[PDB]
PDB file of C-alpha atoms and ligand atoms in Angstrom:
ATOM      1  CA  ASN A   1       2.269   5.350  25.300  1.00 23.04           C
ATOM      2  CA  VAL A   2       1.738   5.047  21.525  1.00 23.17           C
ATOM      3  CA  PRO A   3       4.251   7.105  19.489  1.00 23.56           C
ATOM      4  CA  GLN A   4       3.031  10.193  17.649  1.00 24.55           C
ATOM      5  CA  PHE A   5       3.052   9.872  13.825  1.00 27.26           C
ATOM      6  CA  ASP A   6       4.879  12.874  12.316  1.00 26.57           C
ATOM      7  CA  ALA A   7       2.914  14.084   9.283  1.00 26.59           C
ATOM      8  CA  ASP A   8       5.717  16.363   8.001  1.00 24.02           C
ATOM      9  CA  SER A   9       8.164  13.475   7.998  1.00 23.56           C
ATOM     10  CA  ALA A  10       5.721  11.094   6.223  1.00 22.10           C
ATOM     11  CA  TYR A  11       4.913  13.849   3.673  1.00 23.72           C
ATOM     12  CA  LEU A  12       8.638  14.180   2.920  1.00 25.17           C
ATOM     13  CA  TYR A  13       8.958  10.397   2.275  1.00 26.49           C
ATOM     14  CA  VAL A  14       6.027  10.683  -0.154  1.00 26.61           C
ATOM     15  CA  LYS A  15       7.616  13.677  -1.924  1.00 28.54           C
ATOM     16  CA  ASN A  16      11.059  11.973  -2.173  1.00 27.35           C
ATOM     17  CA  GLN A  17       9.519   9.025  -4.074  1.00 30.23           C
ATOM     18  CA  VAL A  18       7.585  11.324  -6.412  1.00 30.59           C
ATOM     19  CA  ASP A  19      10.852  13.267  -7.020  1.00 29.07           C
ATOM     20  CA  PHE A  20      12.306  10.246  -8.850  1.00 28.88           C
ATOM     21  CA  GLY A  21       9.558  10.655 -11.494  1.00 31.32           C
ATOM     22  CA  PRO A  22       7.194   7.744 -12.332  1.00 32.43           C
ATOM     23  CA  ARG A  23       8.228   4.392 -10.734  1.00 32.95           C
ATOM     24  CA  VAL A  24       7.223   2.271 -13.725  1.00 30.85           C
ATOM     25  CA  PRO A  25       8.657  -1.262 -13.630  1.00 30.52           C
ATOM     26  CA  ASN A  26      11.704  -1.683 -15.950  1.00 27.96           C
ATOM     27  CA  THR A  27      12.757   1.997 -15.773  1.00 28.35           C
ATOM     28  CA  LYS A  28      15.864   3.457 -14.116  1.00 27.77           C
ATOM     29  CA  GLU A  29      13.564   5.669 -11.922  1.00 30.58           C
ATOM     30  CA  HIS A  30      11.942   2.512 -10.533  1.00 31.03           C
ATOM     31  CA  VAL A  31      15.383   0.998  -9.830  1.00 31.80           C
ATOM     32  CA  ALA A  32      16.553   4.199  -8.087  1.00 31.80           C
ATOM     33  CA  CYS A  33      13.416   4.546  -5.961  1.00 32.12           C
ATOM     34  CA  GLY A  34      13.693   0.885  -4.865  1.00 29.41           C
ATOM     35  CA  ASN A  35      17.245   1.564  -3.700  1.00 28.03           C
ATOM     36  CA  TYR A  36      15.982   4.608  -1.775  1.00 27.55           C
ATOM     37  CA  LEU A  37      13.244   2.590  -0.020  1.00 27.84           C
ATOM     38  CA  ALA A  38      15.546  -0.273   0.914  1.00 28.73           C
ATOM     39  CA  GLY A  39      18.093   2.279   2.184  1.00 31.33           C
ATOM     40  CA  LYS A  40      15.501   4.057   4.348  1.00 30.27           C
ATOM     41  CA  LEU A  41      14.345   0.768   5.903  1.00 31.00           C
ATOM     42  CA  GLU A  42      17.981  -0.081   6.732  1.00 30.90           C
ATOM     43  CA  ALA A  43      18.518   3.383   8.207  1.00 27.91           C
ATOM     44  CA  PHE A  44      15.410   2.772  10.367  1.00 26.09           C
ATOM     45  CA  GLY A  45      16.867  -0.428  11.852  1.00 27.00           C
ATOM     46  CA  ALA A  46      14.941  -2.991   9.797  1.00 25.55           C
ATOM     47  CA  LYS A  47      16.366  -6.271   8.561  1.00 26.84           C
ATOM     48  CA  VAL A  48      15.853  -5.869   4.793  1.00 26.73           C
ATOM     49  CA  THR A  49      15.044  -8.786   2.499  1.00 27.81           C
ATOM     50  CA  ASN A  50      14.774  -8.195  -1.249  1.00 30.09           C
ATOM     51  CA  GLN A  51      12.661 -10.410  -3.387  1.00 28.59           C
ATOM     52  CA  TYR A  52      13.659  -9.976  -6.988  1.00 31.95           C
ATOM     53  CA  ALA A  53      11.373 -11.793  -9.412  1.00 29.08           C
ATOM     54  CA  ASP A  54      10.649 -11.908 -13.186  1.00 28.43           C
ATOM     55  CA  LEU A  55       6.862 -11.322 -13.286  1.00 25.30           C
ATOM     56  CA  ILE A  56       4.876 -11.654 -16.486  1.00 29.89           C
ATOM     57  CA  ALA A  57       2.318  -8.886 -17.107  1.00 29.19           C
ATOM     58  CA  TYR A  58      -1.120  -9.161 -18.828  1.00 31.14           C
ATOM     59  CA  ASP A  59       0.490  -8.775 -22.286  1.00 28.69           C
ATOM     60  CA  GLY A  60       3.565 -11.027 -21.834  1.00 29.53           C
ATOM     61  CA  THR A  61       5.930  -8.217 -20.745  1.00 29.72           C
ATOM     62  CA  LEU A  62       8.523  -9.420 -18.246  1.00 29.66           C
ATOM     63  CA  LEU A  63       8.699  -7.022 -15.303  1.00 27.59           C
ATOM     64  CA  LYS A  64      11.937  -6.894 -13.320  1.00 27.55           C
ATOM     65  CA  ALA A  65      10.171  -6.651  -9.973  1.00 30.23           C
ATOM     66  CA  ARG A  66      11.548  -6.181  -6.471  1.00 32.46           C
ATOM     67  CA  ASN A  67       9.449  -6.642  -3.336  1.00 33.20           C
ATOM     68  CA  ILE A  68      11.157  -5.005  -0.321  1.00 34.03           C
ATOM     69  CA  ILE A  69      10.603  -6.356   3.211  1.00 32.79           C
ATOM     70  CA  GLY A  70      11.843  -4.648   6.365  1.00 33.52           C
ATOM     71  CA  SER A  71      11.481  -6.783   9.488  1.00 31.48           C
ATOM     72  CA  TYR A  72      11.573  -5.828  13.176  1.00 29.50           C
ATOM     73  CA  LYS A  73      12.279  -8.440  15.857  1.00 29.58           C
ATOM     74  CA  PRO A  74      12.728 -11.018  13.063  1.00 28.74           C
ATOM     75  CA  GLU A  75      12.960 -14.065  15.350  1.00 27.93           C
ATOM     76  CA  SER A  76       9.518 -13.336  16.818  1.00 26.33           C
ATOM     77  CA  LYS A  77       6.763 -15.683  15.622  1.00 28.06           C
ATOM     78  CA  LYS A  78       3.989 -13.269  16.677  1.00 28.66           C
ATOM     79  CA  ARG A  79       3.904 -10.673  13.920  1.00 28.73           C
ATOM     80  CA  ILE A  80       1.906  -7.961  12.206  1.00 32.55           C
ATOM     81  CA  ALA A  81       2.351  -7.383   8.436  1.00 30.59           C
ATOM     82  CA  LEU A  82       1.958  -3.890   6.978  1.00 31.29           C
ATOM     83  CA  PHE A  83       1.757  -3.620   3.183  1.00 32.12           C
ATOM     84  CA  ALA A  84       1.836  -0.898   0.471  1.00 31.52           C
ATOM     85  CA  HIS A  85       2.549  -1.023  -3.254  1.00 30.55           C
ATOM     86  CA  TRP A  86       5.433   1.149  -4.456  1.00 31.85           C
ATOM     87  CA  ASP A  87       5.269   0.893  -8.258  1.00 33.92           C
ATOM     88  CA  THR A  88       3.246   3.389 -10.297  1.00 35.01           C
ATOM     89  CA  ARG A  89       0.852   2.902 -13.165  1.00 36.09           C
ATOM     90  CA  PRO A  90       2.384   3.382 -16.637  1.00 35.07           C
ATOM     91  CA  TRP A  91      -0.839   4.788 -18.198  1.00 36.85           C
ATOM     92  CA  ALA A  92      -3.060   7.630 -16.997  1.00 36.67           C
ATOM     93  CA  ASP A  93      -5.970   5.581 -18.383  1.00 37.15           C
ATOM     94  CA  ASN A  94      -8.761   7.227 -16.336  1.00 37.17           C
ATOM     95  CA  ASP A  95      -7.721  10.751 -17.306  1.00 36.36           C
ATOM     96  CA  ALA A  96     -10.554  13.071 -18.410  1.00 34.42           C
ATOM     97  CA  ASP A  97      -8.284  14.022 -21.321  1.00 32.99           C
ATOM     98  CA  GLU A  98      -7.903  11.153 -23.798  1.00 27.79           C
ATOM     99  CA  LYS A  99      -4.451  12.551 -24.886  1.00 29.04           C
ATOM    100  CA  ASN A 100      -3.023  11.536 -21.466  1.00 25.74           C
ATOM    101  CA  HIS A 101      -4.159   7.872 -21.649  1.00 24.23           C
ATOM    102  CA  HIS A 102      -0.633   6.547 -22.411  1.00 24.24           C
ATOM    103  CA  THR A 103       1.322   8.868 -20.011  1.00 27.83           C
ATOM    104  CA  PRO A 104       2.827   7.430 -16.798  1.00 26.63           C
ATOM    105  CA  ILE A 105       1.370   8.906 -13.599  1.00 27.83           C
ATOM    106  CA  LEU A 106       3.399  10.312 -10.674  1.00 28.27           C
ATOM    107  CA  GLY A 107       1.427   8.122  -8.233  1.00 27.60           C
ATOM    108  CA  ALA A 108       1.747  10.486  -5.287  1.00 27.06           C
ATOM    109  CA  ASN A 109      -1.398   9.059  -3.692  1.00 28.48           C
ATOM    110  CA  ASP A 110      -1.469   5.753  -5.645  1.00 26.11           C
ATOM    111  CA  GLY A 111       1.929   4.369  -4.679  1.00 28.98           C
ATOM    112  CA  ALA A 112       3.907   6.902  -2.697  1.00 27.54           C
ATOM    113  CA  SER A 113       1.381   7.660   0.090  1.00 27.98           C
ATOM    114  CA  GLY A 114       1.133   4.128   1.533  1.00 25.82           C
ATOM    115  CA  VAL A 115       4.909   3.693   1.358  1.00 23.25           C
ATOM    116  CA  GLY A 116       5.523   7.088   2.972  1.00 21.62           C
ATOM    117  CA  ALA A 117       3.175   6.395   5.838  1.00 22.04           C
ATOM    118  CA  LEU A 118       4.864   2.996   6.448  1.00 21.70           C
ATOM    119  CA  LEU A 119       8.361   4.556   6.394  1.00 19.40           C
ATOM    120  CA  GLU A 120       7.253   6.937   9.151  1.00 19.20           C
ATOM    121  CA  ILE A 121       5.812   3.958  11.076  1.00 19.78           C
ATOM    122  CA  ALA A 122       9.150   2.117  10.589  1.00 21.70           C
ATOM    123  CA  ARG A 123      11.076   5.131  11.970  1.00 17.82           C
ATOM    124  CA  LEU A 124       8.910   5.057  15.112  1.00 17.87           C
ATOM    125  CA  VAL A 125       8.828   1.266  15.490  1.00 18.79           C
ATOM    126  CA  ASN A 126      12.660   1.338  15.443  1.00 15.92           C
ATOM    127  CA  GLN A 127      12.716   3.963  18.182  1.00 20.77           C
ATOM    128  CA  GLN A 128      10.040   2.407  20.487  1.00 21.38           C
ATOM    129  CA  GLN A 129       9.446  -1.257  19.751  1.00 21.85           C
ATOM    130  CA  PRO A 130       5.937  -2.687  20.039  1.00 20.43           C
ATOM    131  CA  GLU A 131       5.408  -6.117  21.598  1.00 23.04           C
ATOM    132  CA  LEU A 132       4.895  -7.961  18.274  1.00 21.49           C
ATOM    133  CA  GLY A 133       7.354  -8.275  15.407  1.00 19.56           C
ATOM    134  CA  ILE A 134       6.500  -5.842  12.598  1.00 17.97           C
ATOM    135  CA  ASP A 135       7.024  -6.424   8.869  1.00 18.54           C
ATOM    136  CA  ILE A 136       6.958  -3.483   6.436  1.00 20.43           C
ATOM    137  CA  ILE A 137       6.363  -4.960   2.988  1.00 22.15           C
ATOM    138  CA  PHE A 138       6.613  -2.822  -0.145  1.00 24.96           C
ATOM    139  CA  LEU A 139       5.013  -4.730  -3.003  1.00 25.61           C
ATOM    140  CA  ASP A 140       6.022  -4.147  -6.614  1.00 22.31           C
ATOM    141  CA  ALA A 141       4.007  -4.483  -9.864  1.00 22.15           C
ATOM    142  CA  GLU A 142       0.600  -3.894  -8.311  1.00 21.82           C
ATOM    143  CA  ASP A 143      -0.543  -1.348 -10.893  1.00 24.09           C
ATOM    144  CA  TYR A 144       0.455  -2.835 -14.255  1.00 23.88           C
ATOM    145  CA  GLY A 145      -3.026  -4.336 -14.695  1.00 28.56           C
ATOM    146  CA  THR A 146      -4.926  -4.384 -17.971  1.00 26.25           C
ATOM    147  CA  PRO A 147      -5.433  -0.839 -19.396  1.00 26.07           C
ATOM    148  CA  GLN A 148      -9.084   0.330 -19.541  1.00 24.59           C
ATOM    149  CA  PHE A 149      -8.623   0.881 -23.288  1.00 22.86           C
ATOM    150  CA  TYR A 150      -7.519  -2.750 -23.903  1.00 27.09           C
ATOM    151  CA  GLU A 151     -10.137  -4.782 -25.809  1.00 24.96           C
ATOM    152  CA  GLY A 152      -9.749  -8.427 -24.834  1.00 27.47           C
ATOM    153  CA  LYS A 153      -9.703 -10.354 -21.562  1.00 30.90           C
ATOM    154  CA  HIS A 154      -9.508  -8.305 -18.296  1.00 29.58           C
ATOM    155  CA  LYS A 155      -8.415 -10.903 -15.730  1.00 27.35           C
ATOM    156  CA  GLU A 156      -8.246 -10.024 -12.000  1.00 28.98           C
ATOM    157  CA  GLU A 157      -4.853 -11.813 -11.713  1.00 29.52           C
ATOM    158  CA  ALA A 158      -3.220  -9.171 -14.001  1.00 28.75           C
ATOM    159  CA  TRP A 159      -3.159  -6.839 -10.998  1.00 28.24           C
ATOM    160  CA  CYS A 160      -1.110  -7.310  -7.868  1.00 28.35           C
ATOM    161  CA  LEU A 161       1.686  -9.403  -9.409  1.00 27.29           C
ATOM    162  CA  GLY A 162       4.109  -8.686  -6.584  1.00 25.02           C
ATOM    163  CA  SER A 163       1.634  -9.617  -3.821  1.00 25.91           C
ATOM    164  CA  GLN A 164       0.762 -12.835  -5.705  1.00 24.81           C
ATOM    165  CA  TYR A 165       4.467 -13.634  -5.850  1.00 21.75           C
ATOM    166  CA  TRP A 166       5.086 -12.809  -2.159  1.00 21.19           C
ATOM    167  CA  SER A 167       1.966 -14.689  -1.088  1.00 17.07           C
ATOM    168  CA  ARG A 168       3.146 -17.863  -2.873  1.00 18.85           C
ATOM    169  CA  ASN A 169       6.831 -17.341  -1.930  1.00 20.85           C
ATOM    170  CA  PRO A 170       7.134 -15.789   1.529  1.00 17.37           C
ATOM    171  CA  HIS A 171      10.440 -14.000   2.301  1.00 19.91           C
ATOM    172  CA  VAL A 172      11.098 -16.490   5.102  1.00 21.13           C
ATOM    173  CA  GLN A 173       9.991 -20.135   5.285  1.00 20.75           C
ATOM    174  CA  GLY A 174       7.016 -20.659   7.577  1.00 19.68           C
ATOM    175  CA  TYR A 175       6.151 -16.945   7.629  1.00 15.20           C
ATOM    176  CA  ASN A 176       3.025 -16.127   9.608  1.00 17.69           C
ATOM    177  CA  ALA A 177       1.352 -12.979  10.921  1.00 18.89           C
ATOM    178  CA  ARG A 178      -1.579 -12.456  13.287  1.00 18.88           C
ATOM    179  CA  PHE A 179      -3.049 -10.083  10.726  1.00 18.35           C
ATOM    180  CA  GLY A 180      -2.165  -7.680   7.963  1.00 17.58           C
ATOM    181  CA  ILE A 181      -2.998  -4.083   7.010  1.00 15.42           C
ATOM    182  CA  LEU A 182      -2.621  -2.818   3.430  1.00 14.95           C
ATOM    183  CA  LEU A 183      -2.479   0.956   2.893  1.00 13.63           C
ATOM    184  CA  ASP A 184      -3.529   2.166  -0.601  1.00 13.14           C
ATOM    185  CA  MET A 185      -4.116   5.862  -1.454  1.00 15.19           C
ATOM    186  CA  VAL A 186      -3.834   7.197   2.088  1.00 14.09           C
ATOM    187  CA  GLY A 187      -2.707  10.780   1.436  1.00 12.12           C
ATOM    188  CA  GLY A 188      -5.459  12.407  -0.644  1.00 11.05           C
ATOM    189  CA  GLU A 189      -7.086  15.682   0.449  1.00 10.22           C
ATOM    190  CA  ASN A 190     -10.548  15.212   2.042  1.00  8.62           C
ATOM    191  CA  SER A 191     -10.344  11.390   1.838  1.00 12.36           C
ATOM    192  CA  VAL A 192     -12.684   9.167   3.911  1.00 11.87           C
ATOM    193  CA  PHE A 193     -12.178   5.415   4.390  1.00 11.99           C
ATOM    194  CA  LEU A 194     -14.974   2.860   4.528  1.00 13.92           C
ATOM    195  CA  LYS A 195     -14.842  -0.833   5.350  1.00 14.55           C
ATOM    196  CA  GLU A 196     -13.777  -2.492   2.102  1.00 10.11           C
ATOM    197  CA  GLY A 197     -15.654  -5.594   0.790  1.00 10.52           C
ATOM    198  CA  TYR A 198     -12.989  -8.306   0.705  1.00  7.60           C
ATOM    199  CA  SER A 199     -11.721  -6.960   4.036  1.00  4.86           C
ATOM    200  CA  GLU A 200     -15.224  -7.583   5.446  1.00  2.94           C
ATOM    201  CA  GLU A 201     -15.319 -11.115   3.912  1.00  6.27           C
ATOM    202  CA  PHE A 202     -11.882 -12.305   5.131  1.00  4.86           C
ATOM    203  CA  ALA A 203     -11.094 -10.171   8.167  1.00  4.85           C
ATOM    204  CA  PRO A 204     -14.190  -8.414   9.623  1.00  2.66           C
ATOM    205  CA  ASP A 205     -12.659  -8.574  13.160  1.00  5.42           C
ATOM    206  CA  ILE A 206      -9.582  -6.690  11.910  1.00  4.71           C
ATOM    207  CA  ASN A 207     -11.762  -4.040  10.265  1.00  2.00           C
ATOM    208  CA  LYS A 208     -13.608  -3.707  13.597  1.00  2.29           C
ATOM    209  CA  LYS A 209     -10.300  -3.273  15.477  1.00  2.00           C
ATOM    210  CA  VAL A 210      -8.924  -0.674  13.059  1.00  2.00           C
ATOM    211  CA  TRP A 211     -12.119   1.423  12.872  1.00  2.00           C
ATOM    212  CA  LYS A 212     -12.464   1.384  16.679  1.00  2.00           C
ATOM    213  CA  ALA A 213      -8.835   2.463  17.074  1.00  2.00           C
ATOM    214  CA  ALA A 214      -9.456   5.313  14.583  1.00  2.00           C
ATOM    215  CA  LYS A 215     -12.468   6.578  16.630  1.00  4.79           C
ATOM    216  CA  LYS A 216     -10.539   6.414  19.919  1.00  2.80           C
ATOM    217  CA  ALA A 217      -7.628   8.403  18.348  1.00  3.51           C
ATOM    218  CA  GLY A 218      -9.983  11.141  17.134  1.00  2.90           C
ATOM    219  CA  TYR A 219     -10.279  10.143  13.439  1.00  5.12           C
ATOM    220  CA  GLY A 220     -13.910   8.903  13.408  1.00  8.58           C
ATOM    221  CA  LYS A 221     -14.781  11.452  10.726  1.00  6.15           C
ATOM    222  CA  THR A 222     -12.044  10.019   8.441  1.00  6.99           C
ATOM    223  CA  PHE A 223     -12.660   6.299   9.229  1.00  5.48           C
ATOM    224  CA  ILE A 224     -16.436   6.097   8.717  1.00  5.30           C
ATOM    225  CA  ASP A 225     -17.981   2.966  10.177  1.00  7.46           C
ATOM    226  CA  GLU A 226     -19.896   1.894   7.065  1.00 10.63           C
ATOM    227  CA  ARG A 227     -19.222  -0.505   4.209  1.00  9.37           C
ATOM    228  CA  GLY A 228     -17.862   0.658   0.854  1.00 13.49           C
ATOM    229  CA  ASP A 229     -16.887  -1.023  -2.392  1.00 14.76           C
ATOM    230  CA  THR A 230     -15.211  -4.356  -3.044  1.00 16.63           C
ATOM    231  CA  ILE A 231     -11.784  -3.608  -4.531  1.00 18.97           C
ATOM    232  CA  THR A 232      -9.320  -5.931  -6.258  1.00 18.76           C
ATOM    233  CA  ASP A 233      -6.100  -5.023  -4.477  1.00 19.92           C
ATOM    234  CA  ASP A 234      -3.045  -6.724  -2.932  1.00 22.48           C
ATOM    235  CA  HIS A 235      -5.003  -7.852   0.175  1.00 22.50           C
ATOM    236  CA  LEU A 236      -7.247 -10.125  -1.959  1.00 29.33           C
ATOM    237  CA  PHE A 237      -4.273 -12.262  -2.922  1.00 26.16           C
ATOM    238  CA  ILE A 238      -2.673 -12.100   0.541  1.00 29.24           C
ATOM    239  CA  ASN A 239      -5.921 -13.422   2.039  1.00 28.06           C
ATOM    240  CA  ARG A 240      -6.441 -16.092  -0.664  1.00 30.74           C
ATOM    241  CA  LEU A 241      -2.868 -17.324  -1.139  1.00 31.58           C
ATOM    242  CA  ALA A 242      -0.943 -16.501   2.073  1.00 32.31           C
ATOM    243  CA  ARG A 243      -4.062 -16.927   4.261  1.00 34.85           C
ATOM    244  CA  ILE A 244      -3.095 -13.926   6.386  1.00 33.30           C
ATOM    245  CA  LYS A 245      -6.184 -11.972   7.520  1.00 34.23           C
ATOM    246  CA  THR A 246      -5.512  -8.647   5.809  1.00 34.11           C
ATOM    247  CA  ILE A 247      -7.691  -5.543   5.366  1.00 34.50           C
ATOM    248  CA  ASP A 248      -7.323  -2.663   2.875  1.00 36.34           C
ATOM    249  CA  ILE A 249      -7.366   0.955   4.042  1.00 34.91           C
ATOM    250  CA  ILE A 250      -8.459   2.617   0.805  1.00 31.73           C
ATOM    251  CA  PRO A 251     -10.623   5.711   0.167  1.00 31.05           C
ATOM    252  CA  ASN A 252     -14.227   5.672  -0.926  1.00 31.24           C
ATOM    253  CA  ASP A 253     -15.451   8.830  -2.682  1.00 27.58           C
ATOM    254  CA  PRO A 254     -19.267   8.958  -3.044  1.00 28.48           C
ATOM    255  CA  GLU A 255     -19.038  10.647  -6.491  1.00 26.29           C
ATOM    256  CA  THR A 256     -16.057   8.869  -8.091  1.00 22.09           C
ATOM    257  CA  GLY A 257     -15.438   5.721  -5.957  1.00 23.41           C
ATOM    258  CA  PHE A 258     -11.673   6.121  -6.037  1.00 24.82           C
ATOM    259  CA  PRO A 259     -10.215   9.630  -5.473  1.00 22.61           C
ATOM    260  CA  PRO A 260     -10.822  11.952  -8.445  1.00 21.39           C
ATOM    261  CA  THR A 261      -7.042  11.976  -9.241  1.00 21.35           C
ATOM    262  CA  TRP A 262      -6.963   8.130  -9.545  1.00 22.22           C
ATOM    263  CA  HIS A 263      -5.101   7.001 -12.719  1.00 21.95           C
ATOM    264  CA  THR A 264      -4.943  10.612 -14.042  1.00 23.42           C
ATOM    265  CA  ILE A 265      -1.956  12.900 -14.542  1.00 23.55           C
ATOM    266  CA  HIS A 266      -3.240  14.880 -11.534  1.00 21.48           C
ATOM    267  CA  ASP A 267      -2.107  12.187  -9.058  1.00 21.57           C
ATOM    268  CA  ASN A 268       0.752  14.359  -7.829  1.00 18.66           C
ATOM    269  CA  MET A 269       1.844  16.288  -4.706  1.00 15.26           C
ATOM    270  CA  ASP A 270      -0.736  19.081  -5.333  1.00 15.66           C
ATOM    271  CA  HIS A 271      -3.502  16.759  -3.996  1.00 13.14           C
ATOM    272  CA  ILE A 272      -1.681  15.196  -1.029  1.00 10.57           C
ATOM    273  CA  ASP A 273      -2.619  16.490   2.451  1.00 13.18           C
ATOM    274  CA  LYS A 274      -0.358  15.512   5.357  1.00 11.66           C
ATOM    275  CA  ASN A 275      -3.448  15.466   7.640  1.00 10.89           C
ATOM    276  CA  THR A 276      -4.760  12.433   5.715  1.00 10.60           C
ATOM    277  CA  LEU A 277      -1.428  10.671   6.194  1.00 12.25           C
ATOM    278  CA  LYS A 278      -1.656  11.529   9.899  1.00 14.67           C
ATOM    279  CA  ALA A 279      -5.189  10.118  10.315  1.00 14.89           C
ATOM    280  CA  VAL A 280      -4.219   6.834   8.687  1.00 16.33           C
ATOM    281  CA  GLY A 281      -0.739   6.579  10.233  1.00 16.19           C
ATOM    282  CA  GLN A 282      -1.749   7.364  13.786  1.00 15.30           C
ATOM    283  CA  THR A 283      -4.621   4.836  13.489  1.00 15.80           C
ATOM    284  CA  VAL A 284      -2.164   2.138  12.342  1.00 13.92           C
ATOM    285  CA  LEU A 285       0.171   2.988  15.299  1.00 14.00           C
ATOM    286  CA  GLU A 286      -2.732   2.759  17.735  1.00 13.13           C
ATOM    287  CA  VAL A 287      -3.561  -0.759  16.428  1.00 10.44           C
ATOM    288  CA  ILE A 288      -0.034  -2.213  16.329  1.00  8.81           C
ATOM    289  CA  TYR A 289       1.027  -0.815  19.742  1.00  7.94           C
ATOM    290  CA  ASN A 290      -2.121  -2.251  21.392  1.00  9.48           C
ATOM    291  CA  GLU A 291      -1.501  -5.843  20.235  1.00 11.91           C
ATOM    292  CA  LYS A 292      -0.154  -8.037  23.109  1.00 10.62           C
TER     293      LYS A 292
HETATM  294  C1  AHN B   1     -11.102  -2.277  -9.041  1.00 10.61           C
HETATM  295  C2  AHN B   1      -9.723  -1.997  -9.670  1.00 10.61           C
HETATM  296  O1  AHN B   1      -9.591  -1.906 -10.886  1.00 10.61           O
HETATM  297  N1  AHN B   1      -8.693  -1.886  -8.833  1.00 10.61           N
HETATM  298  C3  AHN B   1      -7.358  -1.595  -9.354  1.00 10.61           C
HETATM  299  C4  AHN B   1      -6.287  -1.897  -8.295  1.00 10.61           C
HETATM  300  C5  AHN B   1      -5.796  -0.559  -7.867  1.00 10.61           C
HETATM  301  C6  AHN B   1      -4.968   0.197  -8.573  1.00 10.61           C
HETATM  302  N2  AHN B   1      -4.781   1.351  -7.925  1.00 10.61           N
HETATM  303  C7  AHN B   1      -5.517   1.265  -6.817  1.00 10.61           C
HETATM  304  N3  AHN B   1      -6.176   0.104  -6.779  1.00 10.61           N
HETATM  305 ZN1   ZN B   2      -3.466   2.522  -9.337  1.00 12.71          ZN
END
């Protein structure tokens, strides 16, 4: 019996994060939201480990980062890692309107959606424990990468600073997981998810498992069994540095690639659909509960 993901509950966790305002590293709203997330994990029975680190951004800015890890059955050596980034981008640098290019986004889909879905998973995992140990890992400073308008070097390593840190410095010595699943932008209206490129390179068997689970759960029209783009995201560094086979569940829009709200001021609750959260969340539950 796999638990039923509650879309209303997940939607509320997304909204609560967005209600702090932008979660830009080094702002009081970021601090407050981090406290909220750590608090929710504790309330859902997780052992919480905080990883505070001074991460240096593309331009030399020190970011007071905090990765947040909630662990279930922590003494188990057979584990599944679930990841989402919780920071939000400080510049709406893909906005159609050039006047918005320096305005922080709300990151309802890009940030809050992955975290919200994993909080709902954590609530259920607490209630009805799967066989494997589950880690819920909220990664900071994913989205402080080089602005589009920057003229100069655009290095891949500017992104995903928190996952790079976690991947080099696991929260517990000897950490291992059977596989990982990263959720990024999993609440957008009308979103479809295709097999992402690095996911196919490092963990094609995990992609196969997830997409098959989605079909069996009735979400085959949301998880389309075709390949999409190759995307620099937290899973790239987790695969390369931590060597945990990790896939990215991330939308592919045929027109725009990313969702049309991506890195615009329109990434807010108006474009979140709880049915998208449900498709992704139920699929993740179906996978983790069927591991033995
Ligand atoms: C190809 C690319 O620029 N990816 C940026 C990482 C990211 C941010 N938000 C979602 N994905
Ligand atoms: Zn982003």
